Amino acid sequence: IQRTPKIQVYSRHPAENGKSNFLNCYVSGFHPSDIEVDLLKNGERIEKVEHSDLSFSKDWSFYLLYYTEFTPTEKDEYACRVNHVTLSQPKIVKWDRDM
Amino acid sequence: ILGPPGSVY
Amino acid sequence: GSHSMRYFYTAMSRPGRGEPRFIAVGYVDDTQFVRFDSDAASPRMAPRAPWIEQEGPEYWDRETQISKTNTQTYRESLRNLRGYYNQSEAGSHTLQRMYGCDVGPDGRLLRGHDQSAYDGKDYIALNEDLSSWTAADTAAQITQRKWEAAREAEQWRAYLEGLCVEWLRRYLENGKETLQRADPPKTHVTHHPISDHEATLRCWALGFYPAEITLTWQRDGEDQTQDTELVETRPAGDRTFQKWAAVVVPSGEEQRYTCHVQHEGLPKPLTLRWEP
Numbered sequence: 220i221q222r223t224p225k226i227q228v229y230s231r232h233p234a235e236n237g238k239s240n241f242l243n244c245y246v247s248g249f250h251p252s253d254i255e256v257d258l259l260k261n262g263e264r265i266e267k268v269e270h271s272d273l274s275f276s277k278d279w280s281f282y283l284l285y286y287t288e289f290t291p292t293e294k295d296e297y298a299c300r301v302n303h304v305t306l307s308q309p310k311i312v313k314w315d316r317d318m
Numbered sequence: 319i320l321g322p323p324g325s326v327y
Numbered sequence: 328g329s330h331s332m333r334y335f336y337t338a339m340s341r342p343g344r345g346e347p348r349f350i351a352v353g354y355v356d357d358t359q360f361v362r363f364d365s366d367a368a369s370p371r372m373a374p375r376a377p378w379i380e381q382e383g384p385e386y387w388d389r390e391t392q393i394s395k396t397n398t399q400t401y402r403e404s405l406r407n408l409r410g411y412y413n414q415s416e417a418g419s420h421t422l423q424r425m426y427g428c429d430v431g432p433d434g435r436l437l438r439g440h441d442q443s444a445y446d447g448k449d450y451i452a453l454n455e456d457l458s459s460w461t462a463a464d465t466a467a468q469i470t471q472r473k474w475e476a477a478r479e480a481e482q483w484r485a486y487l488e489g490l491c492v493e494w495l496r497r498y499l500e501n502g503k504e505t506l507q508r509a510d511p512p513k514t515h516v517t518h519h520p521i522s523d524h525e526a527t528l529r530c531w532a533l534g535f536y537p538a539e540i541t542l543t544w545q546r547d548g549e550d551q552t553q554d555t556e557l558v559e560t561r562p563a564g565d566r567t568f569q570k571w572a573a574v575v576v577p578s579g580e581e582q583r584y585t586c587h588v589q590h591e592g593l594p595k596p597l598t599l600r601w602e603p
Contacts, residue, residue, distance in 0.1 A: 220447045231563045245561045250447035272362045274335050274352050279444045284562050319494040320393045321486045325477040327404035327470045
């Protein structure tokens with residue numbers, strides 16, 4: 220079967236403009252495991268993004284955390300861009316400080 | 319510590 | 328109180344792109360502590376938590392060899408499973424296994440687990456008796472017959488009641504400052520006007536471990552299950568987890584709503600409200 224990814228974009232710590240933090244994109248609930256995840260800083264791909272080791276939930280679906288160190292501002296916009304076999308085009312989820 | 323190797327499926 | 332150890336195996340074929348990848352990861356509760364990946368420059372079982380680092384070469388050697396053996400076995404298994412479902416050699420497929428033991432506060436076995444899935448569908452599971460199997464379909468029945476003939480359930484029961492519980496107990500002692508420490512959620516409620524007559528109340532739980540938590544909203548003491556937006560528990564990246572629950576409320580009715588939080592790190596459930 221094929222399951223489409225859920226996506227949450229958020230910070231490790233409560234966001235404080237000018238303070239160093241981690242930007243997270245959590246992808247989960249998907250199957251099969253092949254997935255493309257990019258973190259964007261104003262539309263542009265951040266180069267050094269790590270991720271967790273592939274694992275999966277009790278319902279067999281996969282999850283991964285992609286994260287990079289960042290320092291949020293009033294200006295900069297952040298997002299996570301996800302591609303998977305279930306999506307006809309990449310999905311972009313904007314970081315929203317309140318979510 | 320890991321479980322046991324066993325039968326192929 | 329209670330604890331679990333689980334291993335997660337994923338074997339994924341990829342015709343034309345080499346042999347199937349095999350990954351194994353081990354957890355105690357929500358803490359990953361080992362990983363093996365057949366694609367690594369030099370494949371070996373590797374530490375992923377500080378408290379496992381003290382295990383000796385004999386430990387790492389055993390785990391690496393088992394995982395290298397599994398790499399080969401799971402490849403042969405994926406070929407068998409393709410055959411069982413009359414599938415093309417051209418498609419990619421996934422075989423997953425999840426197994427391990429649960430123990431209570433006293434370190435005794437509560438129950439053992441061993442389950443597998445093929446392309447994300449349940450395939451075969453060891454029953455709670457640790458002696459018999461439940462096959463999902465006629466393909467899995469073929470596996471069940473092989474496993475019966477090979478006395479696999481006996482081998483699993485011996486592991487689950489033996490090494491699994493013994494080593495889980497050892498890990499819990501060696502990592503006791505973290506594995507046996509529950510961090511309670513830090514909780515707060517935010518308020519976001521939607522319109523002149525409604526607003527979102529979002530109840531936050533942050534910085535908690537382990538992941539298991541319950542966050543619910545009540546209106547006049549009635550649970551708001553159907554009307555609550557509840558996001559999946561998500562990792563912060565520092566071992567802890569985050570979650571929120573949101574409800575849309577009529578402006579001026581905010582005080583009728585209470586957020587209720589249960590977490591093992593809390594003595595008694597928490598009740599909170601929006602505090603303007």
